[PDB]
Every structure is written in structure tokens, then in C-alpha cells.
């Protein structure tokens, strides 16, 4: 299985208050391991996943000083953007950042990320090459020239190639059992009426980790695709995941249909049919 690390930072402006709310959240493989929130009692980065508690007080303070710096940056940056668009100060607005690196199952760096969004839309993003900038909205084209000519690409590129990947490897070793564990999915097929003469076969995968999974339906062992209903993979709430795929088949043809489950934890793809009774 692949692996990833992300830091998500957000500032949301609040009409009438000088300080935006700023929140930084760190993730490994989409799972939270640290968090900072300025609206807390006394803000500081906090440990979220239990394996993260092996970082000492110095670490939290070092990260905390980074958040405190960024908080002012986001305040100023939100205000400049508020200015540029001649927007009203009586509304709420959102400024976001996400950085980090993607690791393949061979632990190569696959992509480094540095991107910003305003109001939920790409504003500017560092391309996969870590050398060039893609400015979604014209406003950002001014910034792009600034950050190309000034050549501030290698600054962030080095960190993504270096520290991002070194700390992600550190966490995987320290957190192996939960981050490296796989759980095979538990699968079954249920059978549901739809209308006279037609039924829904629904293919369930329960309790798996990681979340990546592929569900397919096959007819005479030919994977159809069209007319297949699927749902966004969802957390079970206990650390594992769920997904299902359903298809409508004519009454009595159910046994020609096969669900296939592909998942890191399985040693061989699963093949299921609806099994009446038994």
C-alpha cells in the first residue's frame, strides 16, 4: 500500500474580529496525528494519534512556533485578498493551504505538494515538477511571476524531497502497527427487491484498512460498469472502512452476476455471488 503525509492549514476570517481562526492539522495516510487550533484555551500543537505521543515537549514547541508565525501570515494574506477583490468585510471568507508528499508503496517520493486555495477554489499550486506554479485565477498570475522570477521553487522543493519524506518515514516506523496494518475486507452480497420482476444485488465490503478498495460487478465474468451504483468509501468509526456497490438484475439471473473485491489486505481478489438461503 501507498503512504502519504499532509499538513492542512486554514484561516477563516470573522467579521468584526482582528484575528482569523487558524487551524493546522497534520495527517499521515489521511489519519490525523497532530493539531493546532487558535480558538483553543491556550493554542499549541496537539498530539492526536497515540503513537505520536513519543514526541517530546521540544517538538510541540517547535511546531507551535511555526503555527504562531503562520497565523499572522494568514491574517495578512486574507486581508490582501479581501482588498484585491473589493469584497465586503461583513462576510466570512476562507484561506487554505495543504503541503506534504505522496509516497508509493516502494517509498519513493511520488509528488510533493504546496498549494493554496481561497474560498475553496485553487488559487495557486506548485506543480508536480516542484519547479513551476499553476495559477488557477488571474489574481494569482501576479504572485506566480513573483515566485518564479524570485525562484522560490527550490525552497519548498527541497523540504518536500527531504524533511517531508524523512519525517513521514519516521512516523511509519514509530506507528507501524496501526499505519502499516492491513485488514482484509469482510464481504457479502445482499438481495433486495426493486420492482416486479427486478432486483438489486448489493455487494458489501466491511472492516477493511486501508480505505483503498475496488468493487466491481461482473456478468458471465465480464465486469460491467454502466448502471452500477456505488457509494463514497466510508469510515466505520472504529478505524476501518466500508463501501458497497449495487446493480439491478432481472429476477432469476442473479447467479450470472459476480462481485469482485480488490484490496491490499487480500492475498487474492475475492469473488462472490448472491447465495440464496443456505
What is the binding site for other proteins (CB under 8 A)?
6, 8, 10, 12, 25, 27, 30, 32, 73, 76-77, 80-81, 83-84, 92, 94, 96, 98, 116-117, 119-125, 127, 134-143, 145-147, 149-150, 152, 190, 192, 195, 202, 204, 206, 225-232, 234-238, 242, 244, 246
Residue nearer to other proteins on the CB measure, 108 or 121: 121
Q: How far is Cα 103 from Cα 75, in angstroms, rounded to an integer? A: 32
Residue nearer to other proteins on the CB measure, 145 or 173: 145
Residue nearer to other proteins on the CB measure, 122 or 161: 122
Residue nearer to other proteins on the CB measure, 50 or 235: 235
Tell the smallest beta-carbon distance from residue 227 to other proteins (Å): 8
Question: ∠67-68-70 over CA atoms, to 5°?
Answer: 60
Residues in Cβ contact with 159 at an 8 Å cutoff, skipping those fewer than 6 apart: none
Q: How far is Cα 69 from Cα 63, in angstroms, rounded to an integer? A: 10
Tell the smallest beta-carbon distance from residue 58 to other proteins (Å): 26
Q: How far is Cα 260 from Cα 253, in angstroms, rounded to an integer? A: 17
Tell the smallest beta-carbon distance from residue 237 to other proteins (Å): 5
List the one residue out of 194, 191, 206 whose CA is nearest residue 273: 191
Q: How far is Cα 90 from Cα 256, in angstroms, rounded to an integer? A: 60
Please state whether the peptide bond connecting residue 145 to the residue before it is cis, i.e. omega within 30 degrees of 0. Answer: no
Residues in Cβ contact with 256 at an 8 Å cutoff, skipping those fewer than 6 apart: 219, 220, 249
Grid coordinates of 91: 462576510
Tell the smallest beta-carbon distance from residue 61 to other proteins (Å): 24
The bridge status of strand 270-272 relative to strand 257-262 is: antiparallel
Residue nearer to other proteins on the CB measure, 120 or 267: 120
Residues in Cβ contact with 190 at an 8 Å cutoff, skipping those fewer than 6 apart: 201, 202, 204, 274
Tell the smallest beta-carbon distance from residue 130 to other proteins (Å): 13
Tell the smallest beta-carbon distance from residue 192 to other proteins (Å): 7
Query: Distances in Å between the alpha carbon of 232 and those of 60, 177, 215, 256?
Result: 35, 26, 11, 26
Tell the smallest beta-carbon distance from residue 29 to other proteins (Å): 12
Q: For residue 1, how many other CB atoms are within 10 A of its CB?
A: 15
Tell the smallest beta-carbon distance from residue 68 to other proteins (Å): 17
Residue nearer to other proteins on the CB measure, 61 or 219: 219
Residue nearer to other proteins on the CB measure, 205 or 270: 205
Residue nearer to other proteins on the CB measure, 17 or 57: 17
Amino acid at each position: 500500500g501507498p503512504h502519504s503525509m499532509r499538513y492542512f492549514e486554514t484561516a477563516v476570517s470573522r467579521p468584526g474580529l482582528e484575528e482569523p481562526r487558524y487551524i493546522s492539522v497534520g495527517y499521515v495516510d489521511n489519519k490525523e496525528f497532530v493539531r493546532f487550533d487558535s480558538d483553543a484555551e491556550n493554542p499549541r500543537y496537539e498530539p492526536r494519534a497515540p503513537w505520536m505521543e513519543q514526541e517530546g515537549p521540544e517538538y510541540w514547541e517547535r511546531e507551535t512556533q511555526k503555527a504562531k508565525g503562520q497565523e499572522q501570515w494568514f491574517r495578512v494574506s486574507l486581508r490582501n485578498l479581501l482588498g484585491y477583490y473589493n469584497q465586503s468585510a461583513g462576510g466570512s471568507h476562507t484561506l487554505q493551504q495543504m503541503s506534504g508528499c505522496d509516497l508509493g508503496s516502494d517509498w519513493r517520493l511520488l509528488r510533493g505538494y504546496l498549494q493554496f486555495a481561497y474560498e475553496g477554489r485553487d488559487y495557486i499550486a506548485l506543480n508536480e515538477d516542484l519547479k513551476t506554479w499553476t495559477a488557477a485565477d488571474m489574481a494569482a498570475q501576479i504572485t506566480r511571476r513573483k515566485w518564479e522570477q524570485s525562484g522560490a521553487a527550490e525552497h519548498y522543493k527541497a523540504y518536500l524531497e527531504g524533511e517531508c519524506v524523512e519525517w513521514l518515514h519516521r512516523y511509519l516506523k514509530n506507528g507501524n502497527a496501526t499505519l502499516l496494518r492491513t485488514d482484509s475486507p469482510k464481504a457479502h452480497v445482499t438481495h433486495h427487491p426493486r420492482s416486479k420482476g427486478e432486483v438489486t444485488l448489493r455487494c458489501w465490503a466491511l472492516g477493511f484498512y486501508p480505505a483503498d478498495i475496488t468493487l466491481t460487478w461482473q456478468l458471465n465474468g465480464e465486469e460491467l460498469t454502466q448502471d452500477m451504483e456505488l457509494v463514497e468509501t466510508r469510515p466505520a468509526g472504529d478505524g476501518t472502512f466500508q463501501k458497497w456497490a449495487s446493480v439491478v438484475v432481472p429476477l432469476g439471473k442473479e447467479q450470472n452476476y459476480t462481485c469482485r473485491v480488490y484490496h491490499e489486505g487480500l492475498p487474492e481478489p475475492l469473488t462472490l455471488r448472491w447465495e440464496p438461503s443456505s
